[PDB]
Structures are given as structure tokens and as C-alpha cells.
Design an enzyme around this catalytic site. Structure first.
Site, short mmCIF file in Angstrom:
data_model
loop_
_atom_site.label_atom_id
_atom_site.label_comp_id
_atom_site.label_asym_id
_atom_site.label_seq_id
_atom_site.Cartn_x
_atom_site.Cartn_y
_atom_site.Cartn_z
N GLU D 60 9.41 0.71 2.16
CA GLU D 60 8.78 1.18 0.93
C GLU D 60 7.29 1.43 1.14
OE1 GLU D 60 8.84 -1.87 -2.11
OE2 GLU D 60 6.67 -1.64 -2.26
N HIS D 61 6.64 0.60 1.96
CA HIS D 61 5.21 0.77 2.20
C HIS D 61 4.93 2.12 2.86
CE1 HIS D 61 4.42 -3.25 0.87
NE2 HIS D 61 3.18 -3.22 1.30
N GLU D 137 -0.87 -9.39 1.95
CA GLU D 137 -0.49 -9.94 0.65
C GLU D 137 0.59 -11.00 0.77
OE1 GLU D 137 0.90 -7.89 2.32
OE2 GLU D 137 1.84 -6.23 1.24
#
Ligand code: HEM
Ligand code: HEM
Lengths: 439, 55, 54, 446, 49, 111, 54, 49, 146, 55
Positions: D60-61, D137
Site C-alpha cells: 500500500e505504501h 511509524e
């Protein structure tokens, strides 16, 4: 389903009546009250009462009254008690929320269309006829500290409070939250004075979502007497320009450098709004590099560390604040502010391209349409319009006004910010954050 | 578990020493003699009282 | 003090043999012992409650 | 003249059409000038083994960082200058990529969405730079007490099963992930039969279907002997995880039991039960007057800083329970009343409070669809879990059939005398022992 | 919920506990009978007659 | 219109019976008003908490001096007694609201 | 276009009876999360975000 | 980095039926709790005697 | 800090230097509200090792012979001060800080930039200070000469 | 060493009910029978035990 963006709806094969859209009804009562009833035939009905009783209307003596008045809902009234209001609302599943900005104060109720008459009584009684018993106000007082603590947990919610404080000596500088010294110092006498002065037909408007006009018409105008002559607001305000710097040892530095812009409704405000998207005022792609954002791209070179920057456009009925808001490490706080500031100067010097303006106009048009797309957002848009102005403007007309913004007006708006009197509010580790005189 | 349990100013809190009292996990079997001694004590009283009704 | 006096009447008549004077007095004292607490005393509180505007 | 029941009937009906390769094209027509279109795919942590766990977050990144047609930031530049918003989310069962724009902008939005799906680039520099991004993150997510606790609850409730993996995945797996695993993951899970392209707004269904036919026709299905892989059941495991860390101020505790699943009709009755218990966190004006007994007591004597009831639904399992935030000397005082409320519905539930719960559930469904963005998610997600999309009127029919007897029976089947899964974090010394927690599922103790 | 009537809710609550209360009374009945082998109860059971 | 349900009480008229009872009760001799001697239950205790500071503090001293009088088995002088006509209910308005609140809360539960 | 949310400028706190206290209009914080340094500070004396009614 | 946590292997102590990760645990839930309560019921029966 | 800030004039003087200066002299004399508990022993050692170093010291005694003072003072360091983001060399800025706390009495301090000590201009301000009056001389007086 | 903080981690804390217990000032003589009843118990047990050594 139907009137969730334009107040005029396209023809959709009239049949059945609920499956058919219609126009919008806008009326102003002889006493000055404004009614804007909507019937979108949705299962859910939403009613909002918009009042010009913002946090700016408090003077120096009764600061924080609006915050307590915002929390004052769900208390005993002259027709329904606190228990009856809380129990009666939840039994039908409805919701009761109060939205308050520096200028307006909206009393919104959301429920199903079958039980909207019950929500009517619980709204007028709360808004118009509160008992404000001394024990109840005293018991609700410690909630002010709790509400202010969580709301100030986000670091960028505190800079905005200081930003208006640094830029004004008057109404608009009042924070949205009760001051640290006023928690416990508010009295039911002040609340009654604030309600009596600032709740009037000339400063109120009733907006509905899925309700007939006569139902809204019959439940509007009873006992509105006088305007808000208590103090400060009701007699104009003025802009000052200052600088407030607070240090709290945080890792990330929040800085807000703004200037004086134009008030809403004015054609110059639209120039800043389209200028707000030329500079870039929010991401459009998740985890994006913000290629089209002029501010972020300008600071991208040189600064190779985490940072964030976007334009800031706080517009009000009488004035406005325009500028950029930045977030950066204390080790390179000054570089990010200076680099972003220099980019705005290039815009003021006429270094702007028409495709850049065209994209910003597209972002402004799209950003506005999705804002009113939601049912809750749609009510806020018309509700504030019925207060700031006396009539509703369809989104198509708004898109025309945005499309009628010349590229020269954007340059002039940039010149106003650069040549204006700045107002800087900073927070975090301010070891390297520059002052106003250092740009 | 049924309520907030309300109340509390009674003799139940004295009984928290038998229910909610913290105790080491590694307490061996050489420790039941504490409760066994209490069992023995009330056993002598129970049988002793009925013995004293004919002695 | 009527109940206390009646309780003393019950004590006095408890130690006496069951004959015709103490049979009548014994029943009356006993029926009054329950009547006072069950009926007269709760009615006494109600009467005064009305007498004190509450 | 327009009652609540009649308004539900007038809601536009979703139109679902299937393509040649199995792509499900769905839309709901409306009158708004704006619209959003997105693609929902059957992918997530549950579909990844331990070796490739966290590929979806890595995939997804890189989804928006460059395609074959638009290398670099050209794909992003097209969206921003157009004025649209691009978003993407991934969970343990689904991932999505939806873009909101004007209704007249639909033809370009669909073309962009096809490029992201079919023509992902995954440049060698992109993985290396995103690997350091993903490792960032992960440290940040350690500070989120709520997300850590739910990861803890998922770890032990479904221990030893694919459902226990995190969406992001372990840090070590992130470091060792290579381009070969990512493209293999794409070629195995990103297939037309397991795909649905949904939209809602001022768009005609014919236009969306034709646009999908133009761009998504190149998508292929039934790649090899694997074709469309099938899932395997994950066994719930009554357990308890306690990360006791006294430095953190507040204690986050989530206790849940196995749920019915996505397609089980008992979700409606369970959702009424959750509404009865309600939610509260230290900022409601109701205070002691709140209808929910748990909320009223928690606010009367200041039991918790926060608490809420959730029903996470999966293909054949779920996590039905509650999560509360409180002081370090309030865990036992509220877990006692939390479980006490559960045993009340299982044993003695009155019709009046079920009516409150039914009304609360009624508003949750109607008010959740406050625009095109949540509607498409409801359209896309339903077509992957429920098969068809359930109309709002049908939901009302199932809601109107719930009474006290149903709630008492349904709650006693999932809550009463069942082993719960407990996850803790922070100062959880007061947190009662599992046997004390387990024995709280039943009353009268005899 | 109907306009604040007089004791409808407690009637519903009572009916929930009636099946268990009726079965709870069996423990008080059978347990007392089990304690003292009551003569006129241990005559209908087939095994313990 | 006072005293007893009958139009005339036993000891002539009806209004004087309550006046006679007030002097018979004897809480005026201690310097206490009628509502200073009420039973403090979970209802009255809350209605005390709503008393204004000027009225609550006055009640405290009236009770405080009465216990001093009761400790010494004494009474206030004839001129310092609470007059029956001058005795006013400072707690009845607060009690009534808690009556109203409790009745609504109790009846809402059964529905 | 006359509102506080369309211009994405000042703040508008919300207090509710069945919803969480939500305050905040658009201002730059999302783009800071991508280069993750904003650690999402702990919920020390804090309520639950995003609310729960949908 | 909290995602690095993994519940250890409990298969050494796990009951034979819940040993399989694929098979649902709800199928044997009635009987897993039935056997444990059977021990308790039989212990109270002996103590009652 | 709480007791020392009970006097409202202490807060204004701390804010006056904060408003006037940006550099060293603007630092308050009390630990900031966010630094209570955030100070570490290594910081104290650095502060001592940088500023408690002879050339910035001076030993003064009353009623003690010079050799006693001289002998006890021959054990000192040879270091000077360091650098600082907010403290080093002071430079006057000039600003305005306004604090509201609902107090009955209002304290205001309006100042400009005077001259440093030793300079002959500082003496001019000092004598000017008593021209305008800088403290009573008669108890409960009407301050005729002020 | 705090004279008020006496040998508290002992049985005296229970005895604070006999020394520092708040009591109404206007207690009449009719309350004395509570303490008299306790003395009657102790007296009856003391004489009873010595009676039981010959009965
Ligand atoms: C800690 C408590 C007690 C201990 C250790 C204890 C110990 C003993 C012992 C060792 C004997 C000798 C029996 C024999 O050798 O045949 C005895 C006898 C006896 N005890 Fe106790 N006793 C206790 C309490 C009591 C009490 C509470 C009672 C009465 C209420 C009682 C009543 C008797 C009587 C009547 C006998 C003589 C009858 C007999 O020996 O079988 N005892 N006791
Ligand atoms: C509240 C506690 C007690 C009460 C009210 C009580 C009462 C009495 C009474 C009324 C008698 C009748 C004496 C007579 O009429 O001549 C009596 C006799 C007796 N009591 Fe108790 N008693 C108590 C405790 C005890 C205790 C603790 C013991 C032994 C440890 C005891 C041992 C005796 C004995 C041996 C007699 C017979 C000797 C005699 O009557 O003088 N009593 N008691």
C-alpha cells in the site's frame, strides 16, 4: 439523499413524493429571525439553531462564559429537566451537539424523521429557556478544566488560540475555552446575562434537514428581545498585530505566521482562498510528497528532515487572518519558516503561472463541494450563511464567484500578506525559531 | 459481578482478607497448616461442646 | 410512656395466678401492647406530620 | 407525509454488475456534483503467512509512489491538480483505494485507479526508501495505547492462526522484505474475481461499467492452479496478555469473546446489545443521567477515562466485547461492572432498554452514510463479506424483529459462560486474575 | 417505553427470574427432604422407595 | 383552616391547635426552626447540599447552639424562642424539587 | 462560501450529549505524519478520538 | 515494534481437541466446560454425602 | 516558585525581562513550569564546570584575615563560560507581554533601554530615578516630593 | 518521631474507636447503658467462670 450539496435539486422523475426532489424554502420573519427549512426526504432529520453568540462576544469581565454555555446543554430548563432531556434524547436515539466558533454558536440536533417533534421541544427549551440552577452550574464547572485539557492536548490547537490573542486587542482575540483563572469564577448571573443579550431574532437563524416549512415556521419566534449590548462585541472590533512565543520543551515546533486579510463575503476574501491553495493547504494523496504544494516543495530543498507546512486562512465577518502554518524540528525551525516565507514573497513579485491558478481554482471548487457534501457539513454551510448574510447562495453561484477571480487579485492578496503587519504565534522549543523582525 | 456493589461499610471488607488478599504464587504445601490449624481449632470446639453436654 | 406503663402492667400481672381479675386485665394489657406499637404509634406520627405543615 | 419507513424505501437501490473476468462493478446513483470511486480487494494480514506478513502495508505504501504509465510523482500530480482526494486503507481482511472528485471527473478517476492496481512499479529505490518509512511509524505506533491493546487482543484471541498477525507486521519482517515477495504478493491476491469497484455520487451506473470495461478488462483471473485461494478457519483461544508498564499513566484493557461472523444474522441482535451498554469518555454532558447503566455509574463516581463496546466481524470469527480506559486503581472496579452488565442482558433484559438499543442502532446505520465516501465503503465492503449489499430498509426489517427475548437468547449464547480474551497495557496490577475474570461470566456461583 | 406507566419494567424483570426462582425452590425443597429423609416425599421416587 | 379534618377541633377552633402544638413540641425553645429538626435521609441530605451559603451557615449555628443547650439541659430565654408565625420553611422549596426529581426518576425506571 | 469549515481556518469545538468532544478544522498535521515524528502523545487525562456513533 | 510480540507455543498444555489451529474452538466448547464442571459436580455430590 | 510568585510584582518583573530581551537577560530566575522534574544531574555538572570557574568568581569575607582568605582560595579552576541558544550575550529587543488573572489590582511595568553599570549614563538614570520617586521616605506619607 | 502516629500498625488503630471517636456533646445519661451492658457481660463471665469451677 437529495439536498446534500445544492439547495436546488435536479429533476429526478417526480413519483411517490419521497422519491422526488424539490426546491428550497427561505424566509425571514418580521422580527428578524431567519428560517431555512429543507425536505430531502431522508430517513434522518437534522435541526440546527445558529446564534451569533461566539466566544468573541465575551468582554474581559465574563471571559469563558461561551465555553460554559457550550457545556451548559443537557441541564434543567423551564420545560424539561436535565434528567428528562438526557433520557428523552437517548430513548429515541437522537444526538444533541453544540458547535461554537469565535463568531457563531450552533445548536444542532440529529434524529430520525419520525420523532423530530420531540427533538423540537428539547431544542427550544435548552436554547431559549434555561433555568441555570446554581448547584447545577457549580457541578458542571470542573468539566471546564477537563474539556480544556483534552482540547489543548493537540499542540496546534493552542497556537491558534495564541494567534488570535497576539493579533487582536478585542473580541476576536478571546480564546474558545474558559481561561485558567475563570474555572470556578463563572456564575449563573453571567450565564443569564449572556443568554439574554446574545440570543435574539436579529442574531439567530433556524436551519432544518428534512422538515416542512410550517413545522419550522411555527416553532421559531417567541421571546427575543434585545441585541448583544453587554460589551466588547456588538460595537465592532480592531486588528492589532503582535507576537506570542511560548516554550514547553516539545520535540516539534509549531509556528503560525499570519497577516491581515479580508472578511468573508468580500471579493478579496476569495482572492486569499484561491491563494490558499496556490500555496497548498492540505494533502490530497495519502503519504504523498505534495508535488503541487508550492510551500512544501519550496522547503523540500535544503531541509532533509521531517517537517510540515500549509497555508492558513482564518476569515471572519469583520476581518481575517491569512498566512502559513508550519511544523518543524527545533534544530531547523528557523529554516523552514524562512524558506516558506520566501516562497510567498516570490508569489507577491508576480512569479505566478496561470496553470497554477487554474489548479488552485479546481482545488477550491472541489474542496468546497465535498465540504457541503456531508449532511452535517451542509447544515453548517447554510447555517453560517443565514447568519453572516441574509440569504443562501447556491454552490453553482459560488463556483462562478471562484471562477471570477482574476490572477492579478491573487498577486495583490499575496502583497497584502507580505507588506502587512504580521502576527506570529509559536510553541515548542523556541531556541532557533526567529522573531517577527527577523522574518 | 452484578452492580457497582454499592454499600461497603459492613463486615464484608473484613472478609476481603480471605478473597482479595495478595499472596505469593510460590507458596508451597507447608503452608496449609495455617488454615489447617484453624480447621483443627474449630473442630475441637465443635466436638468439645457436644462432649461437654454429657461430661 | 403508655407502652412503658403497659409493659409494667404485663410484668405485674405475669407473677400473679390466672384468676378472674387478672384474666380480664391480662388480655387488655396484651391487646394494648400490640395495638399501641402497630396502630397508635404510626398513627401518632402521621397526625403530627399533618400538624407541622408537612 | 414522509414517515421514517417510507424514506428508507425511497433510498436509491445499489446496482451491481459483473465483468468478464469476475470484477464486480457496483454503484449507487445520486444527485451530488461530487463522487468517489474505489476498489476493494480481498487482501490483508490474514492472507499472508509469517514469511510475507506485512506485505500489504508495504504494498500500500508503494501504491501511490509510481506506476508503469506515470513514473515518479506524475500519478500524484494528476490527482492534485485535478482537485481530487486520494486515500487508501488496509485491514486484516480488506484493502481499498478510493478517490473522491467531481462527478464530471469520474472518467479520469477510474483510469487512474486501474493504473494503481494493474501497473504498480515498485522501483528498487522506492522499496529501500519506503522500508525506512515503514520502520518509522512502527516506533510511533508503539505509543498508541489503543492500537497496541487491540493488537495484543488479536494476538492471543486468535493465537497460532493467520488472524493473529498485525497488518503492518513485525519490524524484522519489514527489514527482510524484498521486491520479489511484494510482486509475488500482488500476483497472488490482486485478481479480478476477488475484486469490487464501487462508486457513489452523481454518476450513472452505465458510465462506471463502461469505464471499468475499458480499463479493468486487462485484469486477469484464475492465474494458475491456485486460481482464487480459499481461507481457513481461525480458532478463538481464551487467554490473557498483560504488558505491565507502570510508566504509562492510564490502563487500556480490552476483553472480548468469539463473535458470530460477517454473514451470521446474529450480528443485528448483538449490535443492539452493544448499543444498550453504550459508550462514554469523560466529556459527555449527560454525566450521571446517561441512559446506559454502565455509562451512568462510570460517570457518577468517575470510574473510567474512556470505554466503548465493539463488535469486530470476520469471515467466520469475531471479537465481541469492550475496551475501557481508566486509572490504575479503577480496573477492578469497572471490569466488575462491565461484566455485570453483560450478564444482565444474558439473564434479565427488559423491553424498554432494547427499544433504546434498537433506536440507537437505527441512527447508527442512517447517520453513518453521511456522503459518498462512507457509502462506497459500505457498498464495496458488503460485496466482499455479505455478497450482495443489504438495503437500509432490509436492515430496518431485521432490527424491528429484535426484542428482549432475542437479546437475552443471543447474548447468553456468546457472552454467558464463555472464555474471554483479555489484553492489558500500562499499570495493570489491579487487573483481576483470569479465574476472577472467567468466573465473572456467570451469576449465583452455585 | 410508553409514557411512564406504573411498574411495567419490573414485571418484565420478574418474569426473567421466575424460571430460575421456581427451580431454586427445588433446592430448598429437595435439599431439605434430602437432609432428613422426609417420610412422605421419599415414596414417589422409584429407586428410593 | 388548620388543626384537624373537622371544622372545629376539640379545644375550640382549628388554627390554634397547630399553634398550641408548636409550643408543645418545644423545638422553638431550643432556637431551632421547623426544618432544622427534620430527618436527614438520602433525599433531605441532597436538598441540604443545594442550600445557599447564607442559609446553610445559619442552619449550622442554630443546630450548633441547640446541642449546647441540650448538653446543658437548658433552653433559650422567653424572648429568644422561635415565634410560630415568624417560623418560615427555608427547606420546603428545596425538598419539593428533590421530590419532583426523585418521582420522575423512579417512574421513568418502570416503563 | 460563508462558514468556518469551508475556509479551513479557525477552530470550532463541539460538545455533545451522545458524542465525544471534537474540536478542530483543517490545519497542517497530516503531512507531518508521513515523516513520522509526531508520536501521537499518550492519552494522559484524555477521551477517545474519532467518536463512536457510526 | 509491539507487533514483534507473538504468543508462545501452548501446545504442550493444550487440550487435544483445541490442538488444531484450523478447527474452531466453539465445537467442543460445550464439552470442554462440561468435563470440568463434571468434576465439580461429582466433588460436591461426594461432599454432600 | 509558587511561594516566590505569590507576590504579583515578581511575575511582572519576570515577564518584563522576557518581553524586553530575547537573549540571556530574558531568562526568568525560576525554573520554567515544564522544566520542573526535567533537570538532570549531568546538566548541573555542566553548569558548574562552565560557570563555577575562578575567573568568574570573587571571594569576599568580613572579619577574616587576608592570609586565611588567601590560603583557602588557592584551589580553583581555569575554565570560562560556554555558549547558549537563549543565553550568552544579551541584546535588547523590546516587546509587550500582557497577562490576565482577574486580580483586583493591576500591575504595569513600562520600561525602555537604559545604560549598563559603570557607565556614566547609568548614574544619570539613577539620579533621574529619584527625581520621579522610587520609594517612600515617610511612613504613610503623601509623597509630596515624588 | 510523631507522637500522634503512635504504634498504629497494631491493634491500637482499632482502639481509636475508644479514644478519638467523635461523639455528640449532648449525650444524656440514657446512653451510658451501652457501656454498662458491656460491663454486665464482663462481670457475668468473670463470676460465671469461677462459679463453673465448683458447679
Ligand atoms: C484447642 C482446643 C482443645 C484442645 C487442644 C483439647 C484437648 C483435649 C484432650 C487432649 C483431651 C484428652 C482426651 C483423652 O485423652 O481421652 C480432651 C478432653 C476433653 N475435652 Fe478438650 N480440647 C480442646 C477444646 C475443648 C472444648 C472447647 C471443650 C468443651 C466445650 C472440650 C471438652 C473436653 C472434654 C469434655 C473432654 C473429656 C472427654 C474426653 O476426653 O473424651 N475441649 N481435650
Ligand atoms: C450473659 C451471660 C450470662 C447470663 C445472663 C447468666 C445468667 C444466669 C442466671 C439468671 C443464673 C441463675 C442463678 C440463680 O437463679 O440462682 C445463672 C446461673 C449460673 N451460671 Fe450463668 N449467666 C451468664 C453467663 C455465665 C457464664 C459465662 C458461666 C460460666 C463460665 C455461667 C455459669 C453459671 C452457673 C455455674 C450457674 C449456676 C450457679 C448459680 O446459679 O449460682 N453463667 N446464670
Amino acid at each position: 439523499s437529495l439536498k446534500v450539496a445544492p439547495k436546488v435539486k435536479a429533476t429526478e422523475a417526480p413519483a411517490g413524493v419521497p422519491p422526488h426532489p424539490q426546491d428550497l424554502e427561505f424566509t425571514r420573519l418580521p422580527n428578524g429571525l431567519v428560517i431555512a427549512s429543507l425536505e430531502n426526504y431522508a430517513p434522518a432529520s437534522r435541526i440546527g439553531l445558529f446564534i451569533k453568540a461566539g466566544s468573541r462576544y465575551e468582554n474581559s469581565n465574563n471571559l469563558g462564559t461561551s465555553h460554559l454555555l457550550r457545556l451548559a446543554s443537557s441541564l434543567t430548563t423551564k420545560g424539561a429537566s436535565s434528567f428528562k432531556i438526557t433520557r428523552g434524547i437517548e430513548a429515541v436515539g437522537g444526538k444533541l451537539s453544540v458547535t461554537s466558533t469565535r463568531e457563531n454558536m450552533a445548536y444542532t440536533v440529529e434524529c430520525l424523521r419520525d420523532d423530530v417533534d420531540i427533538l423540537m421541544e428539547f431544542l427550544l427549551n435548552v436554547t431559549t429557556a434555561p433555568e441555570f440552577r446554581r448547584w447545577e452550574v457549580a457541578a458542571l464547572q470542573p468539566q471546564l478544566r477537563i474539556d480544556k485539557a483534552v482540547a489543548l492536548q493537540n499542540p496546534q490547537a493552542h497556537v491558534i488560540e495564541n494567534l488570535h490573542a497576539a493579533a487582536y486587542r478585542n473580541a476576536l482575540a478571546n480564546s474558545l475555552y474558559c481561561p485558567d483563572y475563570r474555572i470556578g469564577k463563572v456564575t449563573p448571573v453571567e450565564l443569564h446575562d449572556y443568554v439574554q443579550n446574545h440570543f435574539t431574532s436579529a442574531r439567530m437563524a433556524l436551519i432544518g434537514l428534512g422538515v416542512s416549512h410550517p413545522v419550522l415556521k411555527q416553532v421559531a419566534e417567541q421571546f427575543l428581545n434585545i441585541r448583544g449590548g453587554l460589551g466588547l462585541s456588538g460595537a465592532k472590533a480592531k486588528y492589532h498585530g503582535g507576537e506570542i512565543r511560548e516554550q514547553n520543551g516539545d520535540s516539534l515546533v509549531h509556528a503560525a505566521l499570519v497577516a491581515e486579510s479580508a472578511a468573508i463575503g468580500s471579493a478579496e476574501a476569495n482572492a486569499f482562498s484561491v491563494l490558499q491553495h496556490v500555496l497548498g493547504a492540505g494533502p490530497h494523496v495519502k503519504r504523498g510528497s505534495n508535488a503541487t504544494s508550492s510551500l512544501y516543495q519550496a522547503v523540500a530543498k535544503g531541509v532533509h528532515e521531517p517537517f510540515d507546512v500549509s497555508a492558513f486562512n482564518a476569515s471572519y465577518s469583520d476581518s481575517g487572518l491569512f498566512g502559513f502554518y508550519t511544523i518543524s524540528q527545533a534544530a531547523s525551525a528557523g529554516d523552514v519558516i524562512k524558506a516558506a516565507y520566501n516562497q510567498v514573497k516570490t508569489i507577491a513579485q508576480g512569479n505566478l503561472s496561470n496553470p497554477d491558478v487554474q489548479a488552485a481554482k479546481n482545488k477550491l471548487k472541489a474542496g468546497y463541494l465535498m465540504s457541503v457534501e456531508s449532511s452535517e457539513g451542509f447544515l453548517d454551510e447554510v447555517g453560517s450563511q443565514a447568519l453572516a448574510a441574509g440569504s443562501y447562495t447556491p454552490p453553482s453561484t459560488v463556483l462562478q464567484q471562484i471562477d471570477a477571480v482574476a490572477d492579478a487579485d491573487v498577486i495583490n492578496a499575496a502583497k497584502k500578506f507580505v507588506s502587512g503587519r504580521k502576527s506570529m504565534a509559536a510553541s515548542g522549543n523556541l531556541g532557533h525559531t526567529p522573531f517577527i523582525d527577523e522574518l | 459481578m452484578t452492580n457497582i456493589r454499592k454499600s461497603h461499610p459492613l463486615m464484608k471488607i473484613v472478609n476481603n482478607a480471605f478473597i482479595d488478599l495478595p499472596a505469593p504464587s510460590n507458596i508451597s504445601s507447608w503452608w496449609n497448616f495455617g488454615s489447617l490449624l484453624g480447621i483443627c481449632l474449630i473442630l475441637q470446639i465443635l466436638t468439645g461442646l457436644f462432649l461437654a453436654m454429657h461430661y | 410512656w403508655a407502652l412503658v406503663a403497659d409493659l409494667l402492667t404485663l410484668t405485674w400481672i405475669g407473677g400473679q395466678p390466672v384468676e378472674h381479675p387478672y384474666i380480664t386485665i391480662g388480655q387488655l394489657a396484651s391487646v394494648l401492647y400490640f395495638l399501641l406499637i402497630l396502630v397508635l404509634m404510626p398513627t401518632a406520627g402521621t397526625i403530627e406530620n399533618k400538624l407541622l405543615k408537612w | 407525509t414522509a414517515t421514517y419507513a417510507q424514506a428508507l424505501q425511497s433510498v436509491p437501490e445499489t446496482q451491481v454488475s459483473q465483468l468478464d473476468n469476475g470484477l464486480r462493478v457496483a454503484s449507487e446513483q445520486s444527485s451530488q456534483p461530487t463522487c468517489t470511486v474505489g476498489v476493494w480487494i480481498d487482501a490483508g494480514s490474514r492472507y499472508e503467512s509469517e514469511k510475507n506478513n506485512g506485505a500489504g502495508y508495504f504494498v500500500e505504501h508503494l501504491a501511490f509512489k509510481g506506476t508503469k504509465n506515470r513514473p515518479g510523482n506524475a500519478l500524484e500530480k494528476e490527482v492534485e491538480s485535478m482537485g481530487a482526494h486520494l486515500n487508501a486503507y488496509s485491514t486484516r481482511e480488506h484493502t481499498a483505494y478510493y478517490i473522491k472528485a467531481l462527478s464530471k471527473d469520474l472518467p479520469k478517476a477510474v483510469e487512474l485507479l486501474a493504473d494503481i492496481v494493474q501497473n504498480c512499479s515498485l522501483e528498487d529505490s522506492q522499496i529501500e526508501k519506503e522500508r525506512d518509512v515503514i520502520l518509522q511509524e512502527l516506533q510511533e505506533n508503539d505509543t498508541s495505547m489503543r492500537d497496541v491493546v487491540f493488537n495484543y487482543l488479536h494476538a492471543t484471541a486468535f493465537q497460532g492462526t493467520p488472524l493473529a498477525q498485525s497488518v503492518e507486521g513485525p519490524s524484522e519482517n519489514v527489514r527482510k522484505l524484498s521486491r520479489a515477495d511484494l510482486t509475488e504478493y500482488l500476483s497472488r491476491h490482486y485478481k479480478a474475481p476477488r475484486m469490487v469497484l464501487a462508486a457513489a455520487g452523481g454518476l450513472e451506473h452505465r458510465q462506471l461499467l463502461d469505464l471499468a470495461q475499458k480499463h479493468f478488462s486487462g485484469l486477469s483471473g484464475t492465474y494458475d492452479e491456485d486460481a482464487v485461494p480459499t481461507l481457513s478457519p481461525c480458532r478463538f483461544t481464551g487467554s490473557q496478555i498483560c504488558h505491565r508498564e507502570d510508566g504509562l499513566p492510564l490502563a487500556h484493557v480490552a476483553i472480548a469473546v468469539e463473535g458470530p461472523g460477517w454473514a451470521h444474522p446474529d450480528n443485528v441482535a448483538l449490535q443492539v446489545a452493544n448499543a444498550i451498554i453504550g459508550h462514554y469518555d469523560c466529556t459527555y454532558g449527560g454525566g450521571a443521567h446517561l441512559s446506559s447503566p454502565l455509562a451512568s455509574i462510570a460517570a457518577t463516581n468517575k470510574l473510567c477515562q474512556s470505554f466503548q463496546t465493539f463488535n469486530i466481524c470476520y469471515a467466520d470469527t469475531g471479537l465481541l466485547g469492550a475496551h475501557f480506559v481508566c486509572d490504575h486503581m479503577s480496573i477492578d472496579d469497572m471490569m466488575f461492572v462491565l461484566q455485570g452488565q453483560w450478564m444482565r442482558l444474558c439473564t434479565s433484559a427488559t423491553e424498554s432498554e432494547v427499544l433504546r438499543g434498537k433506536n440507537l442502532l437505527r441512527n447508527a446505520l442512517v447517520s453513518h452514510l453521511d456522503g459518498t465516501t462512507p457509502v462506497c465503503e459500505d457498498i464495496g465492503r458488503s460485496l466482499l463479506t455479505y455478497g450482495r449489499r443489504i438495503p437500509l430498509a432490509e436492515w430496518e426489517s431485521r432490527i424491528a424483529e429484535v426484542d428482549a427475548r432475542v437479546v437475552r437468547e443471543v447474548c447468553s449464547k456468546y457472552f454467558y459462560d464463555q472464555c474471554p480474551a483479555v489484553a492489558g497495557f500500562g499499570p495493570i496490577e489491579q487487573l483481576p486474575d483470569y479465574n476472577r475474570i472467567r468466573s465473572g461470566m456467570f451469576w449465583l456461583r452455585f | 417505553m410508553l409514557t411512564r406507566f406504573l411498574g411495567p419494567r419490573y414485571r418484565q424483570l420478574a418474569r426473567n427470574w421466575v424460571p430460575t426462582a421456581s427451580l431454586w425452590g427445588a433446592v430448598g425443597a429437595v435439599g431439605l427432604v434430602w437432609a432428613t429423609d422426609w417420610r412422605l416425599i421419599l415414596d414417589w421416587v422409584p429407586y428410593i422407595n | 383552616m388548620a388543626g384537624r379534618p373537622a371544622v372545629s377541633a376539640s379545644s375550640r377552633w382549628l388554627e390554634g391547635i397547630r399553634k398550641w402544638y408548636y409550643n408543645a413540641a418545644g423545638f422553638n425553645k431550643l432556637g431551632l426552626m421547623r426544618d432544622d429538626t427534620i430527618h436527614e435521609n438520602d433525599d433531605v441530605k441532597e436538598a441540604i447540599r443545594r442550600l445557599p451559603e447564607n442559609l446553610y451557615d445559619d442552619r449550622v449555628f442554630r443546630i450548633k447552639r441547640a446541642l449546647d443547650l441540650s448538653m446543658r439541659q437548658q433552653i433559650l430565654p422567653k424572648e429568644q424562642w422561635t415565634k410560630y408565625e415568624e417560623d418560615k420553611s427555608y427547606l420546603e422549596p428545596y425538598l419539593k424539587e428533590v421530590i419532583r426529581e426523585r418521582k420522575e426518576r423512579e417512574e421513568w425506571a418502570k416503563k | 462560501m460563508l462558514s468556518v469549515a469551508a475556509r479551513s481556518g479557525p477552530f470550532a469545538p463541539v460538545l455533545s450529549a451522545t458524542s465525544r468532544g471534537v474540536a478542530g478544522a483543517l490545519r497542517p498535521l497530516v503531512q507531518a505524519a508521513v515523516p513520522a515524528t509526531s508520536e501521537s502523545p499518550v492519552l494522559d487525562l484524555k477521551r477517545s478520538v474519532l467518536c463512536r456513533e457510526s | 515494534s509491539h507487533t514483534d510480540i507473538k504468543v508462545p507455543d501452548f501446545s504442550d498444555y493444550r487440550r487435544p481437541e483445541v490442538l488444531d489451529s484450523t478447527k474452531s474452538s466453539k465445537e467442543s466448547s460445550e464439552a470442554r466446560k462440561g468435563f470440568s464442571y463434571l468434576v465439580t459436580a461429582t466433588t460436591t455430590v461426594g461432599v454432600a454425602y
